[PDB]
Amino acid sequence: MYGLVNKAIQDMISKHHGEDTWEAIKQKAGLEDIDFFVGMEAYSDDVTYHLVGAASEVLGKPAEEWLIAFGEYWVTYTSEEGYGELLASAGDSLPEFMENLDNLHARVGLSFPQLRPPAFECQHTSSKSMELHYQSTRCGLAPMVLGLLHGLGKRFQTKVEVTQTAFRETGEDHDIFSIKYED
Ligand code: HEM
Ligand SMILES: [Xe]
Ligand SMILES: [Xe]
């Protein structure tokens, strides 16, 4: 993934746990040589998965749980590190934002030419609920999506109840979530 993602990981770990903890994770991930991540440069996805695994081990958290926190963090990180106006432009509510997400990533992809963005499709079941389809070229990121949804809930001061109903990993086509939301 692009360096930006790995920078967010480093920043979250450093902020929540300290530089020493980050260094331990970075070493454990096999990344000691890398002095810094380059935000607009592409890295092997392996770099990210290794950080997740190393974070899980050092912190003593399940990786899924850690990925949820990271997904929530991303919503704040992007808004603060150069993508605040882009985020704002994608909407004023959770369901509008999710409808705009593919277009938001298309905009990102203008600048990040190698982007492999996720694809999100909404099927609205009421004015306060939807079924969300998450399609990706990558494995393992559903729990990050859960955190992102909670991050968006906070952003829009909206209560969000989310349950995963289909699993990419268990052979099923793609991840699907049932979501209810209210003010
Ligand atoms: C705020 C709501 C957002 C959600 C829910 C979201 C969702 C995701 C997800 C799930 C991925 C994982 C990649 C995959 O599934 O294959 C991803 C990747 C990525 N996103 Fe978004 N995203 C959001 C906002 C943003 C914003 C504001 C930016 C601005 C830079 C951004 C840029 C990226 C980048 C650079 C990647 C790495 C993909 C790659 O390197 O190929 N995202 N996003
Ligand atoms: Xe991300
Ligand atoms: Xe990640």
CA–CA distances in Å: residue 150 to residues 102, 111, 112, 181: 18, 27, 26, 11
Tell me the C-alpha distance between 95 and 123, whole Å. 10
Tokens of 22: 């980050």
- To the question of whether residue 136 is assigned a binding role by annotation, the answer is yes
For residue 61, give the H/E element and its range.
none
Tokens 């899924």 belong to which residue?
64
- To the question of whether residue 74 is assigned a binding role by annotation, the answer is yes
Q: Give resolution, Å, one decimal.
A: 2.0
- To the question of whether residue 43 is assigned a binding role by annotation, the answer is no
Which numbered ligand comes closest to the C-alpha of 108?
1
Using the mean position of ligand 1's atoms as its centre, give its distance from the Cα of residue 117 in Å. 6
What are the pocket residues of ligand 3 if the criterion is a CB atom closer than 6 Å to any ligand atom?
5, 48, 52, 70, 144
Tell me the C-alpha distance between 31 and 29, whole Å. 6
Closest residue by Cα to residue 54 from 28, 75, 79: 28
Experimental method, per PDB record:
X-ray
Tell me the C-alpha distance between 146 and 177, whole Å. 9
Name the residue type at position 136.
S
Domains and their CATH numbers in the chain = 1-183 (3.90.1520.10)
- Do strands 119-126 and 175-182 pair parallel, antiparallel, or not at all (unpaired)? unpaired
Q: Report yes or no: 23 and 31 within 8 Å, Cβ to Cβ.
A: no
Q: Report yes or no: 112 and 43 within 8 Å, Cβ to Cβ.
A: no
- To the question of whether residue 134 is assigned a binding role by annotation, the answer is yes
Tokens of 96: 């509008």
What are the pocket residues of ligand 1 if the criterion is a CB atom closer than 6 Å to any ligand atom?
1-2, 4-5, 75, 78, 83, 86-87, 101, 105, 108, 112, 115-118, 136-138, 141, 144-145, 148, 152
Q: Report yes or no: 160 and 149 within 8 Å, Cβ to Cβ.
A: yes
Q: Report yes or no: 47 and 120 within 8 Å, Cβ to Cβ.
A: no
Q: Which residues of 2-15 are buried (b: 16+ CB within 10 A; e: fewer)?
A: bbbbbbbbbbbbee
Give the helix ranges, DSSP H, for the chain. Answer: 3-17, 19-28, 45-59, 63-80, 84-89, 94-111, 142-155
